[PDB]
Write a protein that binds this ligand. Structure first.
Ligand code: HEM
Ligand SMILES: *[C@@H]1O[C@H](CO)[C@@H](O)[C@H](O)[C@H]1NC(C)=O
Ligand SMILES: *[C@@H]1O[C@H](CO)[C@@H](O)[C@H](O)[C@H]1NC(C)=O
Ligand SMILES: *[C@@H]1O[C@H](CO)[C@@H](O)[C@H](O)[C@H]1NC(C)=O
Ligand SMILES: *[C@@H]1O[C@H](CO)[C@@H](O)[C@H](O)[C@H]1NC(C)=O
Ligand SMILES: c1ccc2ccccc2c1
Ligand SMILES: [Cl-]
Ligand SMILES: [Mg+2]
Length: 325
């Protein structure tokens, strides 16, 4: 389908309503590394089995959380391009599943959001690095660290100050323990943005004060469950305040080079000085490497989804065409 447009009415409202009750997972219900999408699936804003179209994901993040349209479009089509089935137009918000339909040829993985090093990556707040064996399940130890950082820097709440300290802590923990730690290009960008999301989108819209309480935080992060009487944010937003997170501990993009404590800056990486390069590399390297010589039908689906991705790209970037026009 076409990317949905912005909300007609972007007011704060009850989103934990009669039509969107929380339900526990049934056998085969897929939850993944994103507490946002997990919660929308667990409240039936998305299909409850965690397999969705890009249009369903965009509508769900807007209606359920008041995620802004451009960010919704960028993230959804980026995720779909690397993790989703472009022919069936289905994306798993977690594990690889036959429910996304017949697979494209290798090297494309269609691994869902669980696929490491496409969208999902290292130094997640409440999920472990893939190197440690699980990049998608809620981790009580990591969450307890989030609670401790909220106690120390947020007066018991998660806010942008906490995000800044925790984002840096999780990077230093990956540097110290993950010899395969990667923090470049797409992951470098999204890792910073995702730390603002709890402060911008998990805070009840009637307060919208950027102070997330730990009960609400656990309910989203662990149980994919809106607080009772949860109001979505009172206006469209995504990553506002990311500048505060970055400013706390400015980092260069880089990777461990096969050993712990070997963090080596990558001058080829995009950073916040080159946002258009992040887009260009995502398309010319990441997407193109999954689909280097696509057949007629995949080429058309790639070109359509690449146009949709570009609609999410901040104005001032030149669209790139790895498969021509
Ligand atoms: C718009 C489509 C969305 C997509 C495709 C998406 C995808 C993802 C993925 C793949 C991750 C895992 C990255 C990683 O940490 O390794 C992630 C993390 C996250 N997402 Fe989403 N997301 C979306 C929207 C949202 C929304 C609306 C929210 C909040 C309401 C949200 C909140 C988060 C948070 C907090 C994390 C970090 C989890 C952690 O580090 O512990 N996302 N997202
Ligand atoms: C927009 O939604 C709010 C909250 O549900 C409601 O109070 C208001 O009447 C709505 N506006 C329109 C144009 O329907
Ligand atoms: C959770 O994270 C901690 C700290 O990184 C790790 O030691 C533990 O093995 C992870 N997994 C579980 C299931 O707790
Ligand atoms: C986070 O909370 C702490 C303690 O209340 C406060 O000092 C800090 O200003 C807050 N940061 C933001 C961005 O609200
Ligand atoms: C992407 O490819 C186009 C030509 O197809 C080129 O104009 C652009 O500079 C390339 N981007 C990068 C990352 O080299
Ligand atoms: C909006 C939401 C998330 C983002 C992640 C990385 C870069 C830019 C973003 C803009
Ligand atoms: Cl919007
Ligand atoms: Mg991760």
């Amino acid at each position: 389908g076409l990317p949905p447009g912005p909300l007609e009415n972007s007011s704060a409202k009850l989103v934990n309503d009669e039509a969107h009750p929380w339900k526990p997972l049934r056998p085969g219900d897929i939850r993944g590394p994103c507490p946002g999408l997990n919660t929308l699936a667990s409240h039936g804003y998305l299909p409850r089995n965690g397999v969705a179209t890009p249009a369903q994901i965009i509508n769900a993040v807007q209606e359920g959380f008041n995620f802004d349209n451009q960010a919704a479009i960028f993230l959804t089509y980026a995720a779909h391009l690397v993790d989703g089935n472009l022919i069936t137009d289905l994306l798993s918000i977690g594990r690889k599943t036959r429910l996304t339909g017949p697979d494209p040829p290798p090297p494309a993985s269609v691994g869902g959001l669980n696929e490491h090093g496409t969208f999902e990556g290292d130094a997640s707040m409440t999920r472990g690095d893939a190197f440690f064996g699980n990049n998608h399940d809620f981790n009580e130890t990591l969450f307890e660290q989030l609670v401790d950082y909220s106690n120390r820097f947020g007066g018991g709440k998660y806010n942008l100050t906490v995000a800044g300290e925790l984002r840096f802590k999780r990077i230093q923990d990956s540097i110290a323990t993950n010899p395969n730690f990667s923090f470049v290009d797409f992951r470098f960008f999204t890792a910073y943005g995702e730390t603002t999301f709890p402060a911008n989108l998990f805070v009840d819209g009637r307060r919208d004060d950027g102070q997330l309480d730990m009960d609400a935080a656990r309910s989203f992060f662990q149980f994919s469950r809106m607080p009772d009487d949860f109001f979505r944010a009172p206006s469209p937003r995504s990553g506002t305040g990311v500048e505060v997170v970055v400013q706390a501990h400015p980092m260069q993009p880089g990777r461990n080079v096969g050993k712990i404590n070997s963090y080596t800056v990558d001058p080829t990486s995009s950073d916040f000085s080159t946002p258009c390069l992040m887009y260009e590399k995502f398309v010319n390297i990441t997407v193109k490497s999954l689909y280097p010589n696509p057949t007629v039908q995949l080429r058309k689906a790639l070109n359509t989804n690449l146009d949709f991705l570009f609609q999410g790209v901040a104005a001032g970037c030149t669209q790139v065409f790895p498969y021509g026009r």
